[PDB]
Design a protein around this ligand. Structure first.
Ligand SMILES: Nc1ncnc2c1ncn2[C@@H]1O[C@H](COP(=O)(O)OP(=O)(O)OP(O)(O)=S)[C@@H](O)[C@H]1O
Ligand SMILES: Nc1ncnc2c1ncn2[C@@H]1O[C@H](COP(=O)(O)OP(=O)(O)OP(O)(O)=S)[C@@H](O)[C@H]1O
Ligand SMILES: Nc1ncnc2c1ncn2[C@@H]1O[C@H](COP(=O)(O)OP(=O)(O)OP(O)(O)=S)[C@@H](O)[C@H]1O
Ligand SMILES: Nc1ncnc2c1ncn2[C@@H]1O[C@H](COP(=O)(O)OP(=O)(O)O)[C@@H](O)[C@H]1O
Ligand SMILES: [Mg+2]
Ligand SMILES: [Mg+2]
Ligand SMILES: [Mg+2]
Lengths: 261, 99, 322, 348, 316, 256
């Protein structure tokens, strides 16, 4: 019997708008630790892991594990029914074809019941190993979103290089080149605007910009973004979803042919 | 209104004879600044409409008049039918086509 | 429960049979890492998807299968859009986990236009060391010769009955069905070397008539027996036009046989008959004319009497030769 | 004004021939549930006369108030195609075969459009309205499949009257649900009857023998017979039995073509007759019509032991002309085979 | 991670291409001179149009190749906006180039482009010809419009004569020291059919597949109908024998061959068969008619039997 | 070596927010006096001349006179990367195949180093003479954007009649007529909101509203716009860009 109450309501909306176009069907794996999600794109290039912990919910109780197939377009329309300050209570049965979301006003005046029909999907739980990264860079969310939004105009790819000066985002397209540098910032009045870089070895990898533009719609979830980059390791984009969980992305880098000219 | 009864020319034929060369040197012979057009290059009705009332229906910015321009549309054999419809509606107006 | 075709998809390179050379060459390719792009072509239902899926599950674990294999086919819309969509986006990128080449499995690959084949053959040239394509197709002749000049082509061929019996015996052992000795012979003859039709027709006459004999599968499938074609050809070479025409139209109305199957079985019967050579040339010419004649949508009774007509000319010719 | 269409019948009781089919159609449209019609027969038999007569009997007075509308359609390729429509306030009439390869596009879109159109004051006039598909036989396969889809989905609100000739190329499953009305060509005596009527109205004294000549040279085609009568009136008002009938230029051109064939059996005469065949084909007349004219003017010359093989080769080259795409190769192959067979005939 | 032989043994200079000797020599004259006209190269696949255009562009530009050469291909989108923007502002750009050397737009597979793409192509190649020169590659000139072939110089590449295919094949084989039999190499010619990349891939494929290059190994890794069996079929159809050819037909049908490949190899063997010329014409017409029977959707064994019967009756 | 440095970055954005829609491509000519841009549209009707002097750039260095052809739609995507208070510096060599634009943040957290490819073009110098205009109107620029966008719906052409009662803008079309009157305003708190009309003869002329709507994208360049019109010379729209340059639009008259 899946009852799960969430007081801050628009954070689930921002979680969904991060998954809005990047993925169309996904499976929710439900345990006593909480809500888990692991999916891939239709192109099988980008991996999305979403974890919502048990203690972040207001009243969470769950007797048995639930594998639950979801079309994110249907509840993309259904979570647009939710308000920004509304309380969201999720309810499902052990053998449900149904999903119930109740949207409650903060003054307990407006009550909303919404139903979604579920679909069966085959689940391949791809167990992500714990790997140490050569480079870990934490930077503002709006800054990274602006970085991909400017560099997607020049070309379709970015070359991201982490070295001792800092992090460099490069693009090369038919309009010309583009090279934006970021250095480690010693002193900011707030901890959410600083760029802080931890390193073992300088790395350099190329990434598609459609995927990063899809990734950086998760900007209002967290004020800081952790990019973990290394050689032979995917580009990990960790958003810490407050104290209730984390949203993690995995991008395979592109193939760069080596030319002597 | 001093226009000819044949408002627009429709020279046709096989490729590579010199229709564009003849049109360019006749326009340079008759005191006209040459201006070109490819039709299916910009195949929407609106950009064709903007160019069809911009290349014609206008004076010249240079000095004391200078020289006028005559529109030389190439490759309208493969133009979409809305473009020829816009050209016909700008030809059959009776604000008036002059070049 | 499920139909027997989906329950016994050979999951192991051990379970499958009668494809041992394709097995040996592909495992030799995949152990030493010399696997090129593959183009698997043959008849339907001889196990093209099963061997490549078992090979991809042999290479990778289940926990890394989602990022190293992309499967597409013609159930999705196919053309110039999805070659510039998921296929090269999967092909041009690295692996999220570990290292190694990737795999694109494209089932029924002969259904795309030649512009899409040109886009895909350039995609195959551009990314090769990190992507190994697999195109499964029915007909080789629907594929441009440059694409056949990229990927090595493997012919599965027919499923011979002497290595088609024991898998049917195994599904007989696992699921108890009442099947006689003629059941295996009618299964390996009626399914035309396609084992997907074998396990579908086995379930059809198990669910339909319960017991599996020659008569049950021939009445459920609607195929004419050898005795039926012997009677048909005996009436065509024996009786006059009215009697033979009436006999065959009564038999065709009663048994529900179709003239295309009658034509095929009659053709496979003519070369058993020791006809004179000119008479056999006449018969094969007229019968090929009739089989093209049914393909447009003509009336079936008139072509039936045309077959009787050709056989009446032949019986007059053989008696005139005797 | 021509008398071919000025004295056209309006009611079903003033028909000159096929009175029993007229009474059958009158009692068919007298009751309700008027079904889908497939009218067929030879050219010039009077199918369209029966069709506007059926439209007169089905509706009130306003049946001949017709006008041309022009409707644009869009192919799957981005190209606009303008189609024509003959329409009234009670019915529709479309030729859908003018669009060659995009016939499925117009057959879907145009009848989807007129089906989605609502009959204004539908309680006053009748239950449904009718749609004519004037040239329907040369529509392709999936176009006729969309046609029977259109017949099935709007069976309550829109019934169709398909008019054509030679229904062999018309698909089976549209003939099953359509009531087949067959209009034969009028006989020599009925053609003489309507010629005598159209002359007796206009103050004329046509002899019977010249009416027989007009009927026998019209080849059972009433419009061509009335046009010959008109042209004979223009040529000479005192009508004699020995009158030179003004035959059409393409039939006498085919007669000159045929006598140019039978004159010589050499490749130079084959070049000349290929030029004549090109001059015939450039006038956009159908090559089956040219084939039929060549065989009709050819059988008046050849001997009786050679008509059968000539007729078989005529059918053979007409069929392969239908299978092919360019007419002149099959036509001049037929002419070359006839010359080869005739020179074998007189050579031995 | 070794490279395949199609890309490893690609020529790097213009005298290593054995396709069309006069056209290659004139291309080298234009490479040493500089003022290369607008060219289009047509022919069957594998003749080496791409490597000729690439080697011409390399020998023209040199170090400025990465900025003075735009390669547009079939795997990239080629819509109306692409010829409006990418080709146009490549042709409008400035590159510091020498006196004779010119910018090059390599338009590979130009027959697959739409009509409006070529409509936006034509003005560009006429106007900007003082700076950029178009080197088109294509398979059939019918899908390209006549004006583009008018403004270009058309270079017909022939299907390769088997001798130069042998010379390149000994070059590659001596570069690899791969053992061979002679008749297996002639089988590689027969599997090539004027497609030199197909010959290299089939040799590659076959050696990696099975050691010695012998007729059996190449005919095992290809699995086309065997030339000896189809040649004996056509020979049995020459002397009016329906039955002896039908054992070969049943051999090729119980081996699982599709009818399309059977009739294609029947035509390809009948192309070079030693028989009477008018008889060869009638045979080719009947094989073509049965091939339309196949292509329209009638792929039975009885269509092969009727083909054999018609070939038998046309030989009296 | 050409190097120009600009502190108020957004003014270049205002400058090219309206130039990407009029002319698809433009030529910058560089001299020791500064940087000029005299360009024509594709249909030989509207001319633009933009002057940015060397005094208004804090660092300016022009060793030799240069001509650079810039695609004005390939530059606007190098323009939308800008912040509003960014510092823009532009560099080019004496044999420049490229053009470098370097951005810094107001807090200088990021260093952007874009570099676009130049282009070769046919060059013509069309010398505009010095002439007196019969009517000169100094009018607010936001109102000028408003008036052009509001007679955008009425028709496709405009008629301006400047006479003793003031200036009158008229548009006609199938929806009817739109006629407006602006008079010489006497007392305004700010000089930017005033209208100043200098007249010699009443002048009535006709032009196209599509090009005028293209002209009025330069409303954040200045708070005032000069309209200079006479009998036969084209209409002049002038935006005095800060104290450091001017932008100059010439629109040819329609034919009646
Ligand atoms: N008198 C001439 N002598 C030599 N070359 C000429 C002469 N007149 C024109 N040309 C050149 O030949 C070409 C003339 O053909 P075009 O006018 O460009 O093409 P076209 O005749 O319009 O046919 P299409 O359909 O556009 S390919 C141009 O390249 C001219 O430079
Ligand atoms: N060699 C084989 N050994 C055992 N079972 C086989 C063999 N070949 C086919 N099968 C069975 O046939 C079923 C269908 O196989 P598939 O690989 O899906 O057919 P296919 O070759 O892909 O042909 P398609 O998909 O119709 S083009 C499998 O699930 C197996 O149970
Ligand atoms: N004339 C030749 N001499 C030597 N090698 C050749 C020749 N032609 C082709 N090749 C080889 O075949 C490979 C493929 O040649 P391509 O030029 O790509 O074929 P193509 O002419 O482009 O035909 P397409 O593109 O498949 S239609 C090259 O990489 C060479 O290794
Ligand atoms: N009873 C009749 N009285 C007068 N004219 C008739 C009569 N029946 C037929 N006709 C004439 O015969 C011609 C037949 O033409 P039409 O109806 O178009 O037949 P089709 O559609 O087969 O060509 C018409 O022009 C019509 O004038
Ligand atoms: Mg032209
Ligand atoms: Mg399968
Ligand atoms: Mg190529």
């Amino acid at each position: 019997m899946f009852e799960a109450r969430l007081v801050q309501g628009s954070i689930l909306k921002k979680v969904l708008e991060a998954l809005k176009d990047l993925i169309n069907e996904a499976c929710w794996d439900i345990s006593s630790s909480g809500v888990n999600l692991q999916s891939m794109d239709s192109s099988h290039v980008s991996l999305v892991q979403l974890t919502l912990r048990s203690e972040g919910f207001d009243t969470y109780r769950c007797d048995r594990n639930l594998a639950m197939g979801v079309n994110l377009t249907s509840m993309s329309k259904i979570l647009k029914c939710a308000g920004n300050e509304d309380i969201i209570t999720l309810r499902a049965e052990d053998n449900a074809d149904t999903l119930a979301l109740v949207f409650e006003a903060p003054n307990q005046e407006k009550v909303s019941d919404y139903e979604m029909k579920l679909m069966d999907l085959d689940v391949e739980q791809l167990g992500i190993p714990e790997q140490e990264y050569s480079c870990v860079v934490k930077m503002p969310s709006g800054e990274f979103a602006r970085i991909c939004r400017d560099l997607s105009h020049i070309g379709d790819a970015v070359v991201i290089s982490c070295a001792k000066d800092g992090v460099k985002f490069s693009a090369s397209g038919e309009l010309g080149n583009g090279n934006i540098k970021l250095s480690q910032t010693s002193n900011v009045d707030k901890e959410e605007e600083a760029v802080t870089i931890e390193m073992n070895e300088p790395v350099q990898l190329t990434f598609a910009l459609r995927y990063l533009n899809f990734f950086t719609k998760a900007t209002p979830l967290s004020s800081t973004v952790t990019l973990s980059m290394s050689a032979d390791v995917p580009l990990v984009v960790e958003y810490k979803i407050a104290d209730m969980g984390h949203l993690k992305y995995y991008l395979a880098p592109k193939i760069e042919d080596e030319e002597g000219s | 209104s001093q226009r000819p009864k044949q408002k627009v020319a429709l020279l046709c034929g096989p490729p590579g004879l010199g229709k564009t060369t003849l049109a360019h040197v006749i326009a340079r012979h008759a005191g006209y600044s040459v201006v070109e057009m490819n039709a299916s290059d910009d195949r929407s009705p609106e950009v064709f409409r903007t160019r069809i009332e911009a290349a014609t229906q206008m004076e010249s910015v240079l000095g004391a008049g200078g020289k006028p321009n005559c529109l030389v549309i190439d490759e309208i054999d493969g133009a979409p039918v809305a473009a020829i419809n816009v050209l016909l509606s700008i030809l059959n107006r009776k604000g008036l086509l002059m070049r | 429960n499920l139909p027997w075709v989906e329950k016994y998809r050979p999951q192991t390179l051990n379970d499958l049979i009668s494809h041992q050379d394709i097995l040996s060459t592909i495992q030799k390719f995949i152990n030493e890492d010399r696997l090129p792009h593959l183009l698997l072509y043959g008849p339907p239902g001889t196990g093209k998807t099963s061997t490549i899926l078992a090979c991809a599950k042999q290479l990778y674990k289940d926990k890394e299968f989602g990022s190293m294999v992309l499967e597409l086919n013609a159930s999705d819309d196919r053309g110039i859009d999805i070659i510039r969509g998921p296929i090269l986006s999967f092909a041009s990128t690295r692996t999220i986990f570990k290292k190694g080449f990737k795999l694109v499995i494209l089932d029924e690959a002969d259904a795309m236009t030649q512009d899409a084949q040109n886009a895909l053959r350039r995609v195959i040239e551009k990314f090769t060391e990190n992507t190994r394509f697999c195109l499964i197709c029915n007909y080789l002749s629907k594929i441009i010769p440059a694409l056949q000049s990229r990927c090595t082509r493997f012919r599965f061929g027919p499923l011979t009955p002497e290595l088609m019996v024991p898998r049917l015996e195994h599904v007989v052992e696992e699921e108890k069905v009442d099947i006689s000795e003629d059941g295996m012979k009618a299964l390996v003859t009626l399914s035309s070397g396609d084992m997907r039709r074998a396990l579908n027709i086995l379930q059809s006459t198990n669910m339909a008539f319960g017991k599996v004999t020659e008569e049950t599968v021939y009445t459920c499938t609607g195929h004419p027996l050898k005795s039926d074609i012997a009677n048909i050809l005996d009436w065509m070479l024996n009786q006059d036009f009215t009697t033979a025409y009436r006999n065959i139209t009564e038999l065709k109305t009663l048994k529900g046989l179709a003239l295309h199957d009658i034509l095929t079985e009659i053709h496979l019967f003519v070369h058993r008959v020791d006809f004179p050579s000119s008479v056999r040339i006449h018969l094969l010419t007229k019968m090929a004319d009739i089989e093209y004649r049914l393909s447009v949508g003509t009336n079936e009774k008139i072509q039936l009497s045309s077959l009787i007509a050709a056989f009446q000319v032949t019986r007059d010719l053989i008696v005139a030769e005797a | 004004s021509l008398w071919v269409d000025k004295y056209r019948p309006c009611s079903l009781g003033r028909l000159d021939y096929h009175k029993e089919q007229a009474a059958q159609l009158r009692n068919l449209v007298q009751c309700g549930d008027f079904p889908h019609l497939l009218v067929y027969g030879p050219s010039g038999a009077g199918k369209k006369t029966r069709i506007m007569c059926i439209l007169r009997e089905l509706y009130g007075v306003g049946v001949e108030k017709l006008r041309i509308e022009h409707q644009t359609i869009t192919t799957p390729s981005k190209k606009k195609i303008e189609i024509s429509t003959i329409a009234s306030n009670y019915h529709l009439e479309v030729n859908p075969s003018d669009a060659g390869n995009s016939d499925r596009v117009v057959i879907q879109e145009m009848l989807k459009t007129v089906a989605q159109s609502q009959q204004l004051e539908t309680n006053s006039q009748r239950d449904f309205k009718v749609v004519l598909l004037t040239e329907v036989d040369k529509l392709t396969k999936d176009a006729q499949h969309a046609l029977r889809r259109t017949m099935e989905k709007y069976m309550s609100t829109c019934r169709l009257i398909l008019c054509c000739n030679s229904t062999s190329k018309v698909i089976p499953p549209i003939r099953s649900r359509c009531l087949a009305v067959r209009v034969p060509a009028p006989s020599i005596e009925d053609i003489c009857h309507v010629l005598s009527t159209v002359c007796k109205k206009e103050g004329l004294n046509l002899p019977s023998q010249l009416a027989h000549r007009l009927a026998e040279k019209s080849c059972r085609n009433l419009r061509k017979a009335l046009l010959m009568c008109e042209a004979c009136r223009v040529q000479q008002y005192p009508f004699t039995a020995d009158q030179e009938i003004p035959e059409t230029d393409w039939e006498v051109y085919l007669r000159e073509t045929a006598n140019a064939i039978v004159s010589q059996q050499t490749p130079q005469r084959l070049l000349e007759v290929r030029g004549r065949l090109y001059e015939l084909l450039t006038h956009c007349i159908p090559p089956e019509i040219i084939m039929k004219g060549l065989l009709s003017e050819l059988l008046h010359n050849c001997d009786g032991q050679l008509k059968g093989e000539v007729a078989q080769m005529a059918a053979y080259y007409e069929h392969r002309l239908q299978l092919g795409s360019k007419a002149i190769y099959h036509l001049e192959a037929f002419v070359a085979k006839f010359m080869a067979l005739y020179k074998k005939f007189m050579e031995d | 991670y070794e490279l395949p032989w199609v890309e490893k043994y690609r020529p790097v200079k213009l005298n290593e291409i054995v396709g069309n000797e006069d056209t290659v020599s004139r291309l080298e004259v234009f490479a040493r001179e500089g003022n290369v006209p607008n060219i289009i190269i047509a022919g069957p696949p594998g003749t080496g149009k791409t490597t000729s255009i690439l080697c011409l562009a390399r020998a023209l530009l040199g170090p400025a190749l990465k900025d003075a050469m735009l390669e547009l291909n079939a795997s990239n989108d080629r819509g109306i906006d692409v010829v409006r923007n990418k080709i146009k502002m490549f042709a409008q750009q400035k590159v510091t180039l020498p006196k004779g050397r010119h910018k090059i737009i390599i338009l590979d597979e130009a027959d697959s482009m739409t009509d409006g793409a070529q409509q936006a192509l034509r003005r560009t190649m006429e106007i900007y010809s003082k700076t950029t020169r178009f080197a088109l590659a294509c398979n059939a000139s019918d899908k390209i419009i006549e004006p583009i072939q008018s403004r270009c110089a058309v270079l017909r590449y022939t299907k390769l004569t088997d001798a130069q295919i042998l010379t390149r094949l000994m070059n590659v084989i001596e570069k690899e020291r791969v053992p061979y039999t002679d008749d297996g190499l002639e089988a590689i010619i027969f599997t090539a059919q004027g497609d030199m990349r197909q010959a290299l891939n089939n040799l590659q494929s076959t050696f990696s597949g099975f050691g010695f290059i012998n007729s059996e190994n190449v005919f095992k890794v290809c699995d086309e109908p065997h030339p000896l069996l189809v040649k004996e079929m056509i020979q049995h159809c020459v002397n009016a024998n329906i039955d002896e050819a039908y054992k070969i037909l049943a051999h090729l049908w119980h081996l699982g061959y599709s009818p399309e490949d059977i009739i294609g190899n029947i035509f390809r063997v009948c192309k070079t068969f030693q028989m009477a010329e008018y008889l060869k014409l009638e045979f080719i017409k009947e094989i073509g008619y049965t091939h339309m029977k196949i292509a329209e959707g009638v792929n039975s064994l009885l269509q092969m039997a009727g083909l054999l019967a018609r070939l038998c009756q046309k030989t009296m």
